[PDB]
Antibody, heavy 217, light 219 residues
């Protein structure tokens, strides 16, 4: 029941700062150091620093000293990572992780931080309508910036057979992705299928019902 | 700063077959306190890393005994006795003997399984999107193996070029297949001067290329 749950995705211009939260639950918080490590897109893992909630002492890697600040808020049992003077090279997924006797035994889900001067744009969401076998349906999430978007189905009740594809960067500089699921065709007229799309940078939240296209004239 | 170096795997691993991943440090990871702080983490696609092995050879709670770790000093090995579908991902070693904490560059484990033909589905643009002046046509290739696959769009049997983009998922952690989506983008204008929209798929599990198609404005 150790959990670490991080805040949602961020996007900031070069020169700005960001502050990411890591909510801890389910253990004696003062007894374990919490670490931060980041991962640029298709890259490896880079250690940033750590904080002891017992006394709020910190230690940073040299390359982040003076730019990263870790704090511990005991009443909300939350660690915060703030980093200033952001650079393109700071685009990365930022993780918090609990250490136990130096080993990183529990990791948060990661927070994507994008450093960009491009304009934020929320997506449009369009149905991919299904056409004794299997049927495919989905949602098209078109024309957004920056990453990421999340797509769940039936508010998380439907997970089997879901495929949410990597976003493609269009020539417009905006992303588009599709999320599909395969279901029994016999469920089509009876079971309701809804894709829940979230694009935190633009505060876009869309729930789209996806039904067979009516051939009624 | 201690540098950790991993060795890449030279080929995918067949389901059921053993795998070994190696990691070396630029100096000994033996701490003065007597511990050797070498751990192994696995990162499955889209997920955070998860701890598998700590202090060279100890299995973290709930890690199956098919995983084991060995080594000493500067040379370490993670071993999977029989690789399972859920083992796909990237494996990282990390040292915790000195600050800064440092990681190896990762070793990618891909799964080799039997050929699987894709199920193919074509989706017309929605009416809502057409109102906006653009038509996206989507072709879905579902659960296939191996990854190599060719998708060719045809409009009134004319081969399309330069107006589609595709995306492929990471290898599935349950059946070790891939899925692929291809999007053909036309203006409402260009879309509405043609009738037959086809997606033709070539892949090793298809005896001959498979085409899925629709006619604009038909049931």
């Amino acid at each position: 029941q150790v959990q670490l749950v991080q805040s949602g995705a961020e996007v900031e211009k070069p020169g700005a700062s960001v502050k990411v939260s890591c909510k801890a639950s389910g253990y004696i918080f003062t007894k374990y150091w919490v670490h931060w490590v980041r991962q640029a897109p298709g890259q490896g893992l880079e250690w940033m620093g750590m904080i002891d909630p017992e006394d709020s002492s910190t230690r940073y890697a040299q390359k982040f000293q003076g730019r990263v600040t870790l704090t511990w808020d005991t009443c909300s049992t939350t660690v915060y990572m703030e980093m200033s003077s952001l650079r393109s090279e700071d685009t990365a997924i930022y993780y918090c992780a609990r250490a136990d006797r130096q080993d990183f035994d529990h990791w948060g889900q990661g927070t994507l931080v994008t450093v960009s001067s491009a304009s934020t744009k929320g997506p449009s969401v369009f149905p991919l309508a299904p056409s004794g076998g299997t049927a495919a349906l989905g949602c098209l999430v078109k024309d957004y910036f920056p990453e990421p978007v999340t797509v769940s189905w039936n508010s998380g009740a439907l997970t089997s057979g879901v495929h949410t594809f990597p976003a493609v960067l269009q020539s417009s500089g905006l992303y588009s992705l599709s999320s599909v699921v395969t279901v029994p065709s016999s469920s089509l007229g009876t079971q309701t299928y809804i894709c829940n799309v979230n694009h935190k940078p633009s505060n876009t939240k869309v729930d789209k019902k996806v039904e067979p296209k009516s051939c009624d004239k | 700063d201690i540098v950790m170096t991993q060795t890449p795997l030279s080929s995918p691993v067949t389901l059921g077959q053993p795998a070994s991943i190696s990691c070396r440090s630029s100096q000994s990871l033996l701490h003065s306190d007597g511990n050797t702080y070498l751990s192994w983490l696995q990162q499955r696609p889209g997920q955070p890393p998860r701890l598998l092995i700590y202090k060279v050879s100890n299995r973290f709670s709930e890690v199956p005994d098919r995983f084991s770790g060995s080594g000493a000093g500067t040379d370490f090995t993670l071993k999977i006795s029989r690789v399972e579908a859920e083992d796909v991902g990237i494996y990282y070693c990390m040292q915790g003997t000195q600050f800064p904490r440092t990681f190896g560059q990762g070793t990618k484990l891909e799964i080799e399984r039997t050929v699987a033909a894709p199920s193919v589905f074509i989706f017309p643009p929605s009416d809502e999107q057409l109102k906006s002046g653009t038509a996206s046509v989507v072709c879905l290739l579902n659960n296939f193996y191996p990854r190599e696959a060719k998708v060719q769009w045809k409009v009134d049997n004319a081969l399309q070029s330069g107006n589609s983009q595709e995306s492929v998922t990471e290898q599935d952690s349950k059946d070790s297949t891939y899925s692929l989506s291809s999007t053909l983008t036309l203006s409402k204008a260009d879309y509405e001067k043609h009738k037959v929209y086809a997606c033709e798929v070539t892949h090793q599990g298809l005896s001959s290329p498979v085409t899925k198609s629709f006619n604009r404005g038909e049931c």
